[PDB]
Amino acid sequence: SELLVNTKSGKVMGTRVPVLSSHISAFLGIPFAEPPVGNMRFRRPEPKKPWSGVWNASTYPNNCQQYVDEQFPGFSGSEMWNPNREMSEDCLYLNIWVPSPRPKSTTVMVWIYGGGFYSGSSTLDVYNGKYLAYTEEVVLVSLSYRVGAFGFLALHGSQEAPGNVGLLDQRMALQWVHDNIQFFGGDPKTVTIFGESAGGASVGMHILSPGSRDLFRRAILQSGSPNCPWASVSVAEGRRRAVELGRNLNCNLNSDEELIHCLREKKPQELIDVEWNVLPFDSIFRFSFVPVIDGEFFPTSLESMLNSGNFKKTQILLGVNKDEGSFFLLYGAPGFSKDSESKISREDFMSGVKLSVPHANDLGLDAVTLQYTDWMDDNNGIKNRDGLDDIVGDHNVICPLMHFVNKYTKFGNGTYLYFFNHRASNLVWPEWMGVIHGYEIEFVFGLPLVKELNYTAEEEALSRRIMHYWATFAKTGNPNEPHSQESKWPLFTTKEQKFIDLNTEPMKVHQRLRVQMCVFWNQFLPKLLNAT
Amino acid sequence: SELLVNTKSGKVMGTRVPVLSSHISAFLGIPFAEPPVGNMRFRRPEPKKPWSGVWNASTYPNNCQQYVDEQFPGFSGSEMWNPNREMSEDCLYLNIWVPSPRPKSTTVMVWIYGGGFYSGSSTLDVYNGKYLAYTEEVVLVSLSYRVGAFGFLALHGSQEAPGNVGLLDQRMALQWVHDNIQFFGGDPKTVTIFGESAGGASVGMHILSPGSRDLFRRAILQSGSPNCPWASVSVAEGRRRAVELGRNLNCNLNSDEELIHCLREKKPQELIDVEWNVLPFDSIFRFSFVPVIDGEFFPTSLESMLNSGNFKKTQILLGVNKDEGSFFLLYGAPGFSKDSESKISREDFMSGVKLSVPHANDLGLDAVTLQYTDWMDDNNGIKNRDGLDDIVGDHNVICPLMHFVNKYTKFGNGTYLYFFNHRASNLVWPEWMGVIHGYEIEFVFGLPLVKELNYTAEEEALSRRIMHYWATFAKTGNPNEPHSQESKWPLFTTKEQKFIDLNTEPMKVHQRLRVQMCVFWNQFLPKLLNAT
């Protein structure tokens, strides 16, 4: 049968699913690790013991235990990111969408969800692989990994809570794809890993990590890069955060073993309830339990790895959205709210600045303020709002990514760079948020092809064209068709630094994406904070 | 007789002079102090002992001993600034141009020449008072003062070389005008003092100095302000420079009295020959012997005086030229020369930056470079050239002036601000220098009215209109005619910060002159250099 697949772990039974007036197969909820429950909480994942019988893979699995957004109950804008299945510590599963009839050896795409390393789910409507599987004839995998303290509590030197376990979850699912995707008709030597935000940083981290590099062929990073200032912490900071998490829960803190034992007795929601209490600064775009620079997954500092060419050399496709900061100002910063234009006073600006760059002495806060202030018009509320949106976007997403790109491209085998700036016509978030972090995703997964979801014709065209860029790139290392009549996405090179806009207008090529501001953020400001 | 005037110092005989098809009287070369020669070198000026007989005042006097520019022998562009009479330590004289017939009590204008405090002359063609005297019916005075070490050697604590003697020369000439101008038909209670560059800073300094304030009524400052970073030094720096001057001349340096005695035996040209050797940094727009912050002429720091309102409260008219830095890059900075376009390499830029901000650590040099670099186009040679022109202009002339203006206007009785950006059609300097420091002067003194000098009709109109603004302001405190039909130069106020362009186009009003860059220079950069 088309829906029975025998794998090295055992047989699984999939389900047939309709998609755009046709059908494909889906294998949902396949386990790739042992349940990380009880005394295994905070441990490295272990491989799933093989099973006899047929694993029913007709329904989505559980989402991992995570913070659930309740700021706008019933609002689709926020709820489209929340877990849509029961949450459980038993959550290490993957889903596979396979063209029908089953191919023999086709390009594989593996989606790693974002969520600031504190949340996310493989099961969300906007990550449904079927449209992309069907339209581009790829086998689309989505994995899951532990988030929050379950994935990232870090007591370096201990084997019971080493840190990075959530990245090891991802690595194990990619091992599993390496070892089994052939049986579903995928080609294991053409696995592209793709991710948004923390998913994107996760991608970058598997590019850098020696233990991950062999498991995939090429990589797409959307609005995320492994050096984002939010995506890792030192081992001393990790330690501090885990001790403080235990302090919040009246744990014995005399030893790693006392603390871990204490954290393991707690119900998951007890940990989630106090997770945000351990951040060291009053800040936005900062998350408590994230990857640690441990010497193991990451052998040295990310910057020394990027500088010395200590990473996988391959092709990458990557980019950013125009208004990356908007989400984080909405949720975290005074003066921004969902139902006003959120014009910002000088004083909400200065406060915003200080939340945005939390590691920063006063001279640094002045340097930032100066960089983004139009002093001929310093009390324009639109400008202060847009100004802060840019600061947050640039510091956290755009300039780290631009620094990743420039360092990678000196040793790598082909780089393709984009700037997505089409605001979806049906976006339910307000206008001031612009082209919001995460709203390229729907175009990548093909949702504009579904009439019911109310995108325009031109948006369907943009999505088809983005799906094809992504799938062709996964296939060949190059998003362009060899001898198309269509305009060509050029290669980003060290000297010329080209990139394209992704939007509904005919392709334009530019150079040096936000270079004026990324020199501030990548060169001048760190120099300034080192000398003071 | 119209050309005989009896004054409190004695009788003087002037001369009749033609001007634009008419005639006026000129009294040239009137002494206002004793000759500061021999043992009086470096001393405070003493008042001229009155004389019996008629002082022949038919010819220009001697220029003071100064550095003479020989970079472009025979070139009018540079030679129009050099002494046009014999030089002598005997140089404390003034010149007066008086309408004919002699008025009874008319507005008086007193011109203080620029020259970086190391040079300048009252006798230059472009400072000839006759056109302005004649056209606006003012009595026009030009004074002189000692420059270089003769005017500004400073051994604070000594009475033989106290510092500031050149400013005291100016003060004495203004005493003399106060005491005698009535006899030439001027009104001593309507004396406007006006100056360019160091002349402008000199004006500002008499506004601040308690011993000078009563001697004049109002003030015009052209491209110069008393707080320019080049226009004064501390008493310790003055001292250091004077000792080093003596070191250059094999002087006994064991005491103030040994050193001064030694400097007094030298021929003037010996001092001039080594003056440039005492500057502490490799720098442009820096001059060796300038005003010192002594506690006497200036009772406290200039910034504390400006902040506390410790200055004369009156009306001021003031402004800058578009391309103030060009002259100084030409003479002092690698890559700029008179007969090329002077496109500048990245490396002549960085060198230029370091010459331009000599007091600056590396972080400061980076902050400047960042502020003025278009990183999308960092190797444009036009941009690097123009970029450096702006840095030099802004740091030395425009932003100090803008800081003076804003501080003065909180306590003062009326401010009028301009930006002169007309490039004279007949300018012999190259185009890349643009609207060069000092080239508004000719418009102020009316030289475009003379057919032979080859200005255009529109330039004659601009000059007439500038003469009238300056003379009406001197007369009333306001450059506008009460009920003219012409457009109105508004008042610069604290809140609105208005200013006008001076050029051949119909008047435009703008606000906040170079505010984006002057915040860098007046607020961020000094903060940055204090913290490091």
Ligand SMILES: *[C@@H]1O[C@H](CO)[C@@H](O[C@@H]2O[C@H](CO)[C@@H](O[C@@H]3O[C@H](CO)[C@@H](O)[C@H](O[C@H]4O[C@H](CO)[C@@H](O)[C@H](O)[C@@H]4O)[C@@H]3O)[C@H](O)[C@H]2NC(C)=O)[C@H](O)[C@H]1NC(C)=O
């Ligand atoms: C991704 O990697 C692939 C393969 O690693 C890479 O393609 C390679 O390009 C190089 C060019 O640097 C090719 O090397 C050439 O090989 C041919 C014969 O096979 C030689 O004739 C060439 O030498 C001539 O030209 C040289 C200039 O590069 C001169 O130095 C020399 O004196 C000769 O005149 C040259 O050595 C190599 O063959 C391919 N490899 C394959 C399998 O295609 C590709 O460029 C990389 N992509 C990116 C974007 O980096």
Ligand SMILES: *[C@@H]1O[C@H](CO)[C@@H](O[C@@H]2O[C@H](CO)[C@@H](O[C@@H]3O[C@H](CO)[C@@H](O)[C@H](O[C@H]4O[C@H](CO)[C@@H](O)[C@H](O)[C@@H]4O)[C@@H]3O)[C@H](O)[C@H]2NC(C)=O)[C@H](O)[C@H]1NC(C)=O
């Ligand atoms: C594509 O576009 C269409 C057209 O704009 C859109 O259809 C609309 O969907 C909403 C459902 O969210 C409908 O609004 C409801 O209408 C009913 C019946 O009149 C009301 O009772 C509802 O009110 C309840 O819910 C509200 C809040 O959610 C409460 O405020 C209130 O108290 C009630 O509880 C509600 O207003 C709207 O009627 C349809 N329009 C049409 C023409 O069908 C559709 O949703 C878009 N498709 C997608 C996938 O977004």
Ligand SMILES: *[C@@H]1O[C@H](CO)[C@@H](O[C@@H]2O[C@H](CO)[C@@H](O[C@@H]3O[C@H](CO)[C@@H](O)[C@H](O[C@H]4O[C@H](CO)[C@@H](O)[C@H](O)[C@@H]4O)[C@@H]3O)[C@H](O)[C@H]2NC(C)=O)[C@H](O)[C@H]1NC(C)=O
């Ligand atoms: C330059 O200086 C001159 C003089 O110093 C200055 O003109 C002055 O303006 C002030 C306004 O602040 C005048 O003061 C007024 O005097 C009249 C009567 O003479 C009063 O009626 C006024 O009081 C009324 O209005 C006030 C508002 O300012 C209210 O506070 C009050 O409750 C009353 O309703 C007021 O006291 C002053 O008379 C003139 N002086 C002369 C001689 O003109 C000028 O403004 C200064 N220029 C600049 C640009 O600063």
Ligand SMILES: *[C@@H]1O[C@H](CO)[C@@H](O[C@@H]2O[C@H](CO)[C@@H](O[C@@H]3O[C@H](CO)[C@@H](O)[C@H](O[C@H]4O[C@H](CO)[C@@H](O)[C@H](O)[C@@H]4O)[C@@H]3O)[C@H](O)[C@H]2NC(C)=O)[C@H](O)[C@H]1NC(C)=O
């Ligand atoms: C107003 O505009 C006019 C027209 O442009 C201008 O008149 C010109 O002035 C210059 C004087 O500088 C004249 O040039 C000279 O001409 C004579 C005779 O032909 C030459 O011998 C001169 O050459 C000597 O000087 C040169 C350098 O200074 C040397 O390079 C050479 O070896 C010689 O020593 C010199 O070229 C020009 O001829 C006149 N033109 C006219 C039409 O009269 C006038 O100067 C402008 N007015 C003002 C005040 O600027």
Ligand SMILES: COc1ccc2c(c1)C/C(=C\C1CCN(Cc3ccccc3)CC1)C2=O
């Ligand atoms: C204590 O709780 C907090 C604190 C801060 C933030 C949040 C919760 C949420 C948040 C920002 C948004 C970021 C975008 N998220 C949607 C999204 C998820 C995954 C990929 C893209 C976008 C929703 C939350 C925050 O910045």
Ligand SMILES: COc1ccc2c(c1)C/C(=C\C1CCN(Cc3ccccc3)CC1)C2=O
């Ligand atoms: C060691 O000799 C030096 C060093 C530096 C400079 C100079 C000589 C000259 C100079 C700049 C120009 C500035 C403008 N000066 C013309 C001018 C004088 C008075 C008012 C306006 C313009 C001529 C010299 C300099 O910067």
Ligand SMILES: *[C@@H]1O[C@H](CO[C@@H]2O[C@@H](C)[C@@H](O)[C@@H](O)[C@@H]2O)[C@@H](O)[C@H](O)[C@H]1NC(C)=O
């Ligand atoms: C496979 O599972 C399908 C749906 O499973 C759903 O969830 C599980 C946990 C059960 O509780 C089940 O009753 C739910 O509907 C079934 O519809 C399907 O018949 C199953 N097939 C086999 C062979 O087990």
Ligand SMILES: *[C@@H]1O[C@H](CO[C@@H]2O[C@@H](C)[C@@H](O)[C@@H](O)[C@@H]2O)[C@@H](O)[C@H](O)[C@H]1NC(C)=O
């Ligand atoms: C006044 O002076 C005029 C010009 O003086 C010139 O310089 C002085 C130092 C003398 O050397 C003189 O010969 C020069 O011409 C004379 O033309 C004028 O006649 C003088 N008048 C009187 C009354 O002395």
